[PDB]
From a paper:
PF-8380 (1) was one of the early ATX-inhibitor tool compounds published by Pfizer, which showed inhibition of LPA generation in vivo. Basically, 1 can be divided into three parts, which can to some extent be optimized individually while keeping the fit of the molecule to the active site of ATX preserved. Besides this, metabolic stability of 1 was found to be limited and solubility was determined to be very low. The structures for 10 and 13 showed an identical binding mode as the one determined for the seed compound 1, with an interaction of the ZBG with the active site zinc ion and a good fit to the lipophilic pocket.
Autotaxin (ATX) or ectonucleotide pyrophosphatase/phosphodiesterase 2 (ENPP2) is an extracellular zinc-dependent enzyme that converts lysophosphatidyl choline (LPC) into the bioactive phospholipid lysophosphatidic acid (LPA) and choline. LPA mediates most of its biological effects through six G-protein-coupled receptors (GPCRs) known as LPAR1-6, thus stimulating a variety of biological functions including proliferation, migration, invasion, and survival of many cell types. ATX has attracted substantial interest over the last decade as a potential therapeutic target since the ATX-LPA axis was shown to play a key role in a variety of physiological and pathological conditions including fibrotic diseases, arthritis, glaucoma, and a number of other disorders. In order to confirm the binding mode of the novel ATX-inhibitors with different cores and modified ZBGs, selected compounds were soaked into apo-crystals of rat ATX and their structures were determined by X-ray crystallography.
Residue numbers in the entry: 51 to 463, 468 to 573, 576 to 861
Write the structure that this text describes.
């Protein structure tokens, strides 16, 4: 119940939202149908439009007018944004030369530069170049401020997930807004774009920037705007708030534009109808900058121009229908469109089997434009599993396509030409970032970065301590003139043991054999030095990774590789090796085909055993350091140590062998040597974090050998590829992956073909950031470089996307 008989007199765009049944005057009241009776008359004035004219200059103040051209308007903070231009011979901000803003130039009584977040729905990254001729205000922010070529959204590339990620620094799986549509089985409640459930605070997890600000004594404007408040009025409201007294004035504000998303859905991302929405957004930016300039705030405020996601060409005719695959289609509920999520129509249906649904959806049509996944098998880079609101079955949809349950869903609802929601590495889904103001750098381009990082930077801009989030605080310090965040490297929790030769061959009863009994003081001291770490500076380029949890492990040195060997998991946490451009690939000799050798530095009790692999008819083994890349026939024996062995499904070995035998040497040739760190990952509860021993769901039959869920590799070289990886003076280049350790290649529809036709495509899909691997392993990499720690944090957040320009 709303007692709408209260009044908005003196309350228009109140920041403190008053509680029912008292009627509301805030920028959301319209959305809750709760505004006081006189809200439109008092708060949404339109009389005489939005622009001063020659005739209105020095006019008598008429309080019915939308904005003012009277002599008192600047003191009152309610001038039309073009007042000084029309009435005082001033220039529009866009016509002024760019001048470096070295220091905040703020009015007396400003404690900190305000932040204004100018958020634009569906603003695709390529609009900055393709629309530059029609967006002069935005082009001036972009060229004079700090900009990225693009900013990577979160998956799914939908509105609410991305806006709430911007506000919180969290993955959707953690903030809980995992789609524009959601069912929460614990609440038994549905979140929809239309209707009231979405306003319930139980959907919205983490701590958004406006709450972080308020809790630390920093006042915030209300970020959400009702669609019916015109953009001109949102801008005049922000400018009025900025004119409040020091004790009442917010330090942080958001503007939101429904464009260009709204038009992009109707006309496609580059439809000729898209020019006018881009012009209209640019005019709004011009109104804000002219308005700041009038208030002497244009060299005081930090402005962020940011999008939520891009926009792709999508039409009704590019729809896959589940009714073409499933006999049982009425037994499922599909969340449809540019992604799919499937659950049982009824939890009382005992016959519902997700295994049968996945199999019916797997590689059934030659050009099939979606791929089914159990959510724990999705690429780890999506971080899209650890939430009860994410259905177990997921459909990753090809760019330009939709999935729907039945044809009647598509033509009983063509109209639309654009959509978004696809995989967040897709070029069409990329969005924009520009930072302009005293705290941002001047005329600076920064590399592309992920929107999860912005919450930390917005906290840096406001002097706030950020709530715990998925950003890497410091990874964006290169955007900032000042207020940088200078973290310390995490403390190593476990120190390694450095075992020497402690066990005799005959103490091992592992069921292992090797034809290695083939026999010199020249090269007997040489092998001793290799085992004491004489080549370690060649194979461990960036220091040993730090172990950030309590465990028992050993450093093992060899001629060609170094490893941190876990006594708890009976395998390496990490294996490190350098392959020069000149390295040669060799075969596994016939005599060593099934060779596994005891490691005399490591107790039989802390070793794997071959008999477990022989007995396990599903499980085989591979090697973390590839025998194919041994430096010499004698060094190759080291690669067959039981301490280099890891459990591998035969289906996965096809992937691993091709990576090790073909791709490592290819990368070394292309990059002028590579350093590789490889290892296992255990994430049985799909939370993106290292499992403890007691979370492991699968062992090699009859053993305590745990089965990884994933295998990682981090492949580092010199950004200046004229310098070899092992002699690099400057910045580094990295590519990484987290390959799912699966007992089939059902993910790869072309897997019956030679590995050269499908393994690289699989590895590209499972590209990762070093930071993703850190979360999954509890390791901290790049501890010992020449480089600034902030530069290393940027490197650790890099994602190699394999997309074109
Ligand atoms: C991305 O960044 C985020 C933020 O840093 C990381 O998320 C954190 O991960 C931590 C580890 O998973 C997690 O810590 C847990 O917190 C529990 C208390 O949580 C509540 O309070 C916090 C603080 O106010 C709040 O943020 C939480 O919010 C979550 O839950 C609500 C639902 O009520 C959601 O609205 C909100 O969206 C958020 O959901 C997300 O997190 C939860 C898990 O907390 C997920 O289940 C959701 O799917 C969603 O992803 C909560 O309101 C605390 O109880 C936990 O403690 C257990 O574990 C410790 C281990 O140290 C153990 O020693 C304790 O005894 C305890 O065990 C007991 O409980 C077990 C579970 O019931 C039980 O099995 C045992 O038998 C024991 O009795 C734990 O400390 C932290 O909450 C989240 N924070 C957020 C915001 O998500 C995330 O990891 C990062 N991602 C990556 C890849 O790095
Ligand atoms: O329903 C909507 C939008 C609903 N609101 C979004 C939030 N918004 C707003 O003012 O957010 C401001 C804001 C909030 C936050 Cl958390 C963070 C910041 Cl940086 C800024 C008001 C409109 C919509 C829009 C586009 C869509 N495309 C599509 O397929 O479905 C769509 C639905
Ligand atoms: Ca959107
Ligand atoms: Ca885990
Ligand atoms: K086996
Ligand atoms: Na296959
Ligand atoms: Zn949209």
């Amino acid at each position: 119940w709303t007692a709408t008989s209260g009044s908005c007199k003196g309350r228009c765009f109140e920041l403190q939202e008053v509680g029912p049944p008292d009627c509301r005057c805030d920028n959301l009241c319209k959305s809750y149908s709760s505004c006081c009776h006189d809200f439109d008359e008092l708060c949404l004035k339109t009389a005489r439009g939005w622009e001063c004219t020659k005739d209105r200059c020095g006019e008598v103040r008429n309080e019915e007018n939308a904005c003012h051209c009277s002599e008192d308007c600047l003191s009152r903070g309610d001038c039309c944004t073009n007042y000084q231009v029309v009435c005082k011979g001033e220039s529009h901000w866009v016509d002024d030369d760019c001048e470096e803003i070295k220091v905040p130039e703020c009015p007396a009584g400003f404690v900190r530069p305000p932040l204004i977040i100018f958020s634009v729905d569906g603003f695709r990254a390529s609009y900055m170049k393709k629309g530059s001729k029609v967006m002069p205000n935005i082009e001036k922010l972009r060229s004079c401020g700090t900009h990225a070529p693009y900013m990577r959204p979160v998956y799914p590339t939908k509105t609410f997930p991305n806006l709430y990620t911007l506000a919180t620094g969290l993955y959707p799986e953690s903030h809980g807004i995992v789609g524009n549509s959601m069912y929460d089985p614990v609440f038994d409640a549905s979140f929809h774009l239309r209707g009231r459930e979405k306003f319930n605070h139980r959907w919205w997890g983490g701590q958004p920037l406006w709450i972080t600000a308020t809790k630390q004594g920093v006042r915030a404007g209300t970020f959400f705007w009702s669609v019916s408040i015109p953009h001109e009025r949102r801008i005049l409201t922000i400018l009025q708030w900025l004119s409040l007294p020091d004790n009442e004035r917010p330090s942080v504000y958001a503007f939101y534009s429904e464009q260009p998303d709204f038009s992009g859905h109707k006309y496609g991302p580059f439809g000729p109808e898209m020019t006018n929405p881009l012009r209209e957004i640019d005019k709004t930016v011009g109104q804000l900058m002219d308005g700041l300039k009038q208030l002497r705030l244009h060299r005081c405020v930090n402005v962020i121009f940011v999008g939520d996601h891009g926009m792709e060409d999508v039409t009704c005719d590019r729809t896959e229908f589940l009714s073409n695959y499933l006999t049982n289609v009425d037994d499922i509920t599909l969340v449809p469109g540019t992604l799919g999520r499937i659950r049982a129509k009824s939890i009382n249906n005992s016959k519902y089997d997700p295994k049968t649904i996945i199999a019916a959806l797997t590689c059934k049509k030659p050009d099939q434009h979606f791929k089914p996944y159990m959510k724990q098998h999705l690429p780890k880079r999506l971080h899209y599993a650890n939430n009860r609101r994410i259905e177990d079955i997921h459909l990753l949809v090809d760019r330009r396509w939709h999935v729907a349950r039945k044809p009647l869903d598509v033509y009983k609802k063509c109209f639309f030409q654009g959509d978004h929601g696809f995989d967040n590495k897709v070029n069409s889904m990329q969005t924009v970032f520009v930072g302009y103001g005293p705290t941002f750098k001047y005329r600076t381009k920064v590399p592309p970065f992920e929107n999860i990082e912005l919450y930390n930077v917005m906290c840096d801009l406001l002097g706030l301590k950020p709530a715990p989030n998925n950003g890497t605080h410091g990874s964006l310090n290169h955007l900032l003139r000042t207020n940088t965040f200078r973290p310390t490297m995490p403390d190593e929790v476990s120190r390694p043991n450095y075992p020497g030769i402690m066990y005799l061959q005959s103490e091992f009863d592992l069921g292992c054999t090797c034809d290695d009994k083939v026999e010199n003081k020249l090269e007997e001291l040489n092998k001793r030095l290799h085992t004491k770490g004489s080549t370690k500076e060649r194979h461990l380029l960036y220091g040993r990774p730090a172990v950030l949890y309590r465990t028992s492990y050993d450093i093992l040195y060899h001629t060609d590789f170094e490893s941190g060997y876990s006594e708890i998991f009976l395998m390496p946490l990490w294996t490190s090796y350098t392959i020069s451009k000149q390295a040669e690939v060799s075969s596994i000799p016939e005599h060593l085909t099934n060779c596994v050798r005891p490691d005399v530095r490591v107790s039989p009790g802390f070793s794997q055993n071959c008999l477990a692999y022989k007995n396990d008819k599903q499980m085989s083994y591979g090697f973390l350091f590839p025998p194919y890349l041994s430096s010499s026939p004698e060094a190759k024996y080291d690669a067959f140590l039981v301490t280099n062995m890891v459990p591998m499904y035969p289906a996965f070995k096809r992937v691993w062998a091709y990576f090790q035998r073909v791709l490592v040497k290819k990368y070394a040739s292309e990059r002028n040597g590579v350093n590789v760190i490889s290892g296992p990952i255990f994430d049985y509860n799909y939370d993106g974090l290292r499992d403890t021993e007691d979370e492991i769901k699968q062992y090699v039959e009859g053993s305590s050998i745990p089965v990884p869920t994933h295998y990682y590799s981090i492949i580092t070289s010199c950004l200046d590829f004229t310098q070899p990886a092992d002699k690099c003076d400057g910045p580094l280049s990295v590519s990484s992956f987290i390959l799912p350790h699966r007992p089939d290649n059902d993910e790869s529809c072309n897997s019956s073909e030679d590995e050269s036709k499908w393994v690289e495509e699989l590895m590209k899909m499972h590209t990762a950031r070093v930071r993703d691997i850190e979360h999954l392993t509890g390791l901290d990499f790049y501890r010992k470089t020449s480089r600034s720690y902030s530069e290393i944090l940027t490197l650790k957040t890099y994602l190699h996307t394999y997309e074109s320009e």
